[PDB]
Amino acid sequence: QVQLQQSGTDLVRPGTSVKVSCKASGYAFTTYFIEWVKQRPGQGLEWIGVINPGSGIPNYNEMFKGKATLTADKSSSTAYLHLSSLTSDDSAVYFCARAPYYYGSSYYYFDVWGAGTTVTVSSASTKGPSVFPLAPSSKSTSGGTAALGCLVKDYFPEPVTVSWNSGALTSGVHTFPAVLQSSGLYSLSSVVTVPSSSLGTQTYICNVNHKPSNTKVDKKVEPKSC
Amino acid sequence: DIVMSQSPSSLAVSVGEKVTMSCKSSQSLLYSSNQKNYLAWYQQKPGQSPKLLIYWASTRDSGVPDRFTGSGSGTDFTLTISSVKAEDLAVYCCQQYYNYPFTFGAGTKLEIKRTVAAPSVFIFPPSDEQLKSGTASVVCLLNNFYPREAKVQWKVDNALQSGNSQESVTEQDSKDSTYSLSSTLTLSKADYEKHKVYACEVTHQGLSSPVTKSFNRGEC
Ligand SMILES: [Cl-]
Ligand SMILES: [Cl-]
Ligand SMILES: [Cl-]
Ligand SMILES: [Cl-]
DSSP, X not given: OOEEEEOOOEEEOTTOOEEEEEEEESSOGGGSEEEEEEEXXXXXXXXXXXXXXXXXXXXXXXXXXXXXXXXXXXXXXXEEEEEOXXXXXGOEEEEEEEEOOOTTOOOOOOOEEOOOEEEEEOSSOOBOOEEEEEOOOGGGGGGGEEEEEEEEEEEBSSOOEEEEGGGTOOTTEEEOOOEEOTTSOEXXXXXXXXXXXXXXXXXXXXXXXXXXXXXXXXXXXXXXXX | OXXXXXXXXXXXXXXXXXXXXXXXXXXXXXXXXXXXXOEEEEEEOTTSOOEEEEETTTEEOTTOOTTEEEEEETTEEEEEESXXXXXXXXXXXXXXXXXXXOEEOOOEEEEEEOOOBOOEEEEEOOOHHHHHTTEEEEEEEEEEEBSSOOEEEEEETTEEOOXXXXXXXXXXXXXXXXXXXXXXXXXXXXXXXXXXXXXXXXXXXXXXXXXXXXEETTTO
């Protein structure tokens, strides 16, 4: 029931700064270390630094001491990662992780990890998505199985989340990695395979959430006879 | 700084088979005082944060199944999975916590090997809503195939298209071990309305010959 809850996705402009937060619960915040780790797309983990929330004292990797500053607020059980003077190399996911403080030592593995915070560094503005239905062609329903979906188009930055029928429909769902279009905006599809006989009868709604733009959209997908 | 090195960078193994993967450090992680190796392994599944798997080189974390075993000492360590299951696909990375700055290996990507599965192909004409906005996106879905390598080509009135499509592929499914793929053809409304036949042609190991899924605009 130990958990570290991280702040949401950040879009920040080159040269400016960002603060990532890590709120601990289910344990005594001041009795374990908080570690911070960087992960760039599909690449290895890099250790940034560590803070003792009881004393407030941080220790940095020499690779990050100018880029990163660690603080902790005891009253709110929250640790913070401040990143400064940002560049495109700072676009990454930042994890906080807990590490034991047993036997008076900081030399420990990392036993509980937050979900990560995505930071995108860019001069482009936030933009919410348009959501379009993906209705199968007739022959894309042959043989008793069909597919349908939603196209989540022209948004910035990543990520979006997509569910179906408010989470009741999970079987056969595929939500694809977004691609960056030549406009500099992302486009993503989510699809689900369903019995072809159900296209007339069951309601299918994709639930789209783009938290950077505070955009929430539910789109009902219907078949098109054409 | 200590350098952590992992091999192989990736491997594929069938369900039920044994896998071993290697982690080395540029200097010894064995502390003479307490005879412990300051070495951990993490598992990172797609869409997820790293999860602690092994520490002190050979201690399983609470709740980790016993088919995961860590071994080794000093500078040479191994992670063994005795009988791989379909849900074990992940990147496995090691970490030394012996010396600041703490450092991680680059990870071993474990992929699941299964029998060949041809894709099921579906195609979606653009919606009337989108067409009102001046653009037409045509989407082709390749569902539940294996192996990952697949080729998609778009044809508009049998003219091969270049430069106007993008695609992306899911991570491997943790249950049936397949992949899926989505490709989007983007045209202006004006161009969409000037042509009749929209086709995605799919090449894959499980298909004896390429498969074309197509529709005619306005018959669809
Ligand atoms: Cl968020
Ligand atoms: Cl907007
Ligand atoms: Cl209709
Ligand atoms: Cl298990």
